[PDB]
Structures are given as structure tokens and as C-alpha cells.
Design a protein around this ligand. Structure first.
Ligand SMILES: [Zn+2]
Lengths: 106, 106, 106
């Protein structure tokens, strides 16, 4: 995968979670989110195609996605135990990290 | 993702496979299982938050998930060729590895 | 996951994309494709079980899957922006890379 594809996928999965009903619908979406965050962690963003792989912008771009995946894991564990409303609140809070990570590298 | 989220997801996907009908339902679940095992391989479990990354407990925790993903790949290849009953038997055997890996790090 | 499981999964997801209707059906399939390509990048194929990890056959087998995942990311970004027909054309072109990578390591 590439970068903006992962970002757009995180957005759309957050919306699906916003309109989900049962714990399975929330859980598979959160797993799609984890997959997209992982792929984006392996990606190269628009704002730094030719920086150094050891350049602070480059590796901060990836610590950002590790950070996002941690909150995703919190939300996943909530969804698996059936805590649907708790997981949806965790996801609406995930939105902030998603959006801030997005605009920082558009 | 984090650890117990992946473990709970493997459990739930194994149950879905236990109650699946066609090869697609088994195959996508087995791919969710592979994704969860991969994420858990990248995770830090409850029983060893502050061990060494080169501590035998730490890396054995991860060889365990590599081991699990191998059997998952067997089951996936069975499901893709349409061998639905074969893949479900492979998954009910996957349960043992899943559960033993679980209790070992609760 | 293992190798031929990932290859068969890429084939089947390409067929699902060939018969998809809305952007979500194309997008989740393309994400299953990215996941399978990633797993296969972490796999060991049939034609080189006991080569060197630094053997040119071995690492070329994996640059091939990095290459495949790049086109998958293109198709994902197309699907996320709602460009359904564009993403399906990108996938029917993905088929060539998939098949050539397949026969090269059967
Ligand atoms: Zn990975």
C-alpha cells in the first residue's frame, strides 16, 4: 500500500465504526485500520520522498503510525470484549490522531 | 494492535470458521487470523513488558506467533483450493496452538 | 501465511474486484490483496527453500512482492476516492504482475 490510501482507509473505517451496530462490525473495521496503519508505517509519504531514511522527519512520520496503531489496539481490545460503545468512543478519539497525522504530511 | 486484542481476535475468527459455510467465509477469516498473528508478533505481551528485546522469554513469545502463522498459512492454502472441511479441521487444530500461546502469556 | 496461499488469495480477490459494484467492495478486496502481498513478502517460496537469504533469487522474490504492493496501493487510492472503474482497470493490470510473479516461482 501507499500513504494517502492508508489515510483515506482509516477515515472511511472510522466512519463505518461511527455507524456500526454489533461488535463484529466494529472489530473487523478496527482490524482494517490496524492493517492500514501498518502499511503506512512501511510507506513513504508525500512530504519527504527523498529525505534520509534516518532523517528525523522520516522516522517521526513512522513513530506517528506506531502511535496510531497503539490506540487502534486499545479500541480492538474493547470491541472484542463486547464493549461496543466504549470502542466507538475510543475510535472517535482515534480520529484526532488520524487527522493530525494526515495534515502534517499532506 | 496489541496482544490480547490479537488473541481474542484469533479466538473469534476460529469460532466463525467453526460456523462457516463456503470457502470465502473460511478464507477471509483465516486472513484476519494471519493479520492478528502478525500484529501480535509485533506486540509486547503482558508477562514481559520490561524484559530485554533479546531476552529468551521475549523472542520465544514471537517465535510462538511465527509458529502460529505457519499453521494459519496451511489452513489458508486449503481454503483457497476449496477444501473447506480440510481447512476447518486445520483450524480446529490451530485452536491448540492459539490457546497454549494464550495461557502462557496471560 | 505461506506463499501459494497468498498467490491464490491475490487471484481470488482480483476476481472479486472484477465482479464488484461499489467502492467499498473494491477497497476491502484491495486491502486483502495488500495483506496477502505483505505476508508473501515475509514468506519463503517453493523454488528456493534452502537458498541463501542474501541469494539474488531469494531477495528478488521479495522485491517482486514489494513491486506488486506498490501497484496495489495505486489501486487502493483510486478506490478510496470513489474512482471505481479506474481502480478496476488498475486491478486488471495488476493481474499481469500477479501471474508473472506466480509462474516464476511455481
Ligand atoms: Zn508487517
Amino acid at each position: 500500500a501507499d500513504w494517502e490510501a492508508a489515510m483515506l482507509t482509516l477515515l472511511m473505517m472510522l466512519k463505518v465504526i461511527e455507524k456500526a451496530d454489533n461488535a463484529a462490525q466494529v472489530l473487523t473495521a478496527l482490524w482494517f485500520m490496524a492493517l492500514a496503519a501498518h502499511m503506512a508505517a512501511l510507506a513513504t509519504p508525500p512530504k519527504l520522498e527523498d529525505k534520509s531514511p534516518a532523517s528525523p522527519e522520516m522516522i517521526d512520520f513512522r513513530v506517528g503510525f506506531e502511535e496510531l496503531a497503539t490506540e487502534i489496539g486499545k479500541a480492538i481490545k474493547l470491541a472484542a470484549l463486547g464493549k461496543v460503545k466504549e470502542a466507538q468512543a475510543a475510535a472517535e478519539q482515534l480520529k484526532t490522531t488520524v487527522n493530525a497525522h494526515w495534515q502534517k504530511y499532506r
